[PDB]
Short mmCIF file of C-alpha atoms in Angstrom, two decimals:
data_model
loop_
_atom_site.label_atom_id
_atom_site.label_comp_id
_atom_site.label_asym_id
_atom_site.label_seq_id
_atom_site.Cartn_x
_atom_site.Cartn_y
_atom_site.Cartn_z
CA UNK Q 917 -5.32 6.76 163.85
CA UNK Q 918 -5.26 4.82 160.58
CA UNK Q 919 -4.31 5.10 156.92
CA UNK Q 920 -4.10 3.04 153.75
CA UNK Q 921 -1.16 2.25 151.52
CA UNK Q 922 -1.60 0.95 147.99
CA UNK Q 923 1.10 -0.87 146.08
CA UNK Q 924 1.08 -1.94 142.47
CA UNK Q 925 2.66 -5.36 141.92
CA UNK Q 926 2.86 -7.16 138.53
CA UNK Q 927 0.85 -10.36 138.20
CA UNK Q 928 3.93 -12.49 137.48
CA UNK Q 929 5.44 -11.43 140.84
CA UNK Q 930 2.36 -11.54 143.05
CA UNK Q 931 3.11 -15.10 144.10
CA UNK Q 932 6.12 -13.80 146.05
CA UNK Q 933 3.76 -11.95 148.39
CA UNK Q 934 1.14 -14.61 149.12
CA UNK Q 935 3.53 -17.41 149.99
CA UNK Q 936 2.45 -20.96 150.80
CA UNK Q 937 -1.04 -20.46 149.42
CA UNK Q 938 -1.31 -17.26 151.43
CA UNK Q 939 0.98 -18.29 154.32
CA UNK Q 940 3.28 -15.27 154.02
CA UNK Q 941 0.63 -12.63 153.34
CA UNK Q 942 -1.04 -14.15 156.39
CA UNK Q 943 2.09 -14.03 158.56
CA UNK Q 944 2.79 -10.37 157.71
CA UNK Q 945 -0.75 -9.57 158.74
CA UNK Q 946 -0.27 -11.44 162.00
CA UNK Q 947 2.98 -9.62 162.81
CA UNK Q 948 2.37 -6.10 161.51
CA UNK Q 949 -1.24 -6.31 162.62
CA UNK Q 950 -2.39 -4.95 159.25
CA UNK Q 951 -5.18 -6.16 157.06
CA UNK Q 952 -3.35 -6.82 153.81
CA UNK Q 953 -5.40 -7.48 150.70
CA UNK Q 954 -4.91 -7.74 146.93
CA UNK Q 955 -7.12 -6.88 143.95
CA UNK Q 956 -9.10 -9.63 142.22
CA UNK Q 957 -6.98 -11.84 139.93
CA UNK Q 958 -8.17 -10.01 136.81
CA UNK Q 959 -7.73 -6.45 138.09
CA UNK Q 960 -4.67 -4.42 137.12
CA UNK Q 961 -4.04 -0.67 137.08
CA UNK Q 962 -5.38 1.13 133.98
CA UNK Q 963 -2.49 0.98 131.52
CA UNK Q 964 -0.50 -1.86 133.12
CA UNK Q 965 -0.59 -5.48 134.26
CA UNK Q 966 -0.02 -4.78 137.98
CA UNK Q 967 -2.45 -6.06 140.61
CA UNK Q 968 -3.12 -3.75 143.58
CA UNK Q 969 -2.18 -4.61 147.15
CA UNK Q 970 -3.78 -2.61 149.91
CA UNK Q 971 -2.43 -2.34 153.45
CA UNK Q 972 -4.53 -0.57 156.06
CA UNK Q 973 -3.73 0.08 159.69
CA UNK Q 974 -1.62 2.35 161.88
CA UNK Q 975 0.63 4.64 159.85
CA UNK Q 976 3.53 2.89 161.54
CA UNK Q 977 2.19 -0.62 161.06
CA UNK Q 978 1.46 0.08 157.37
CA UNK Q 979 5.03 1.36 157.05
CA UNK Q 980 6.55 -1.81 158.43
CA UNK Q 981 4.15 -4.16 156.56
CA UNK Q 982 4.78 -2.21 153.40
CA UNK Q 983 8.51 -2.84 153.85
CA UNK Q 984 8.07 -6.58 154.51
CA UNK Q 985 5.83 -7.00 151.47
CA UNK Q 986 8.29 -5.07 149.27
CA UNK Q 987 11.31 -6.97 150.62
CA UNK Q 988 10.08 -10.14 148.87
CA UNK Q 989 9.68 -8.49 145.44
#
């Protein structure tokens, strides 16, 4: 089936995920086959400064993708 994984990543680190103007974030989607997305520039979690990245796909694909994304941070 399918699930969704949400990761909080501080604004000052977010660039490590996107890559060449999105290149990386795009590659990981291509490979893992997961739709990876991030909250609008100005949106952080309640009492923090962390944007929200959301990975959705197979439980297994979201596991891998998750890992790749996290590797960079």
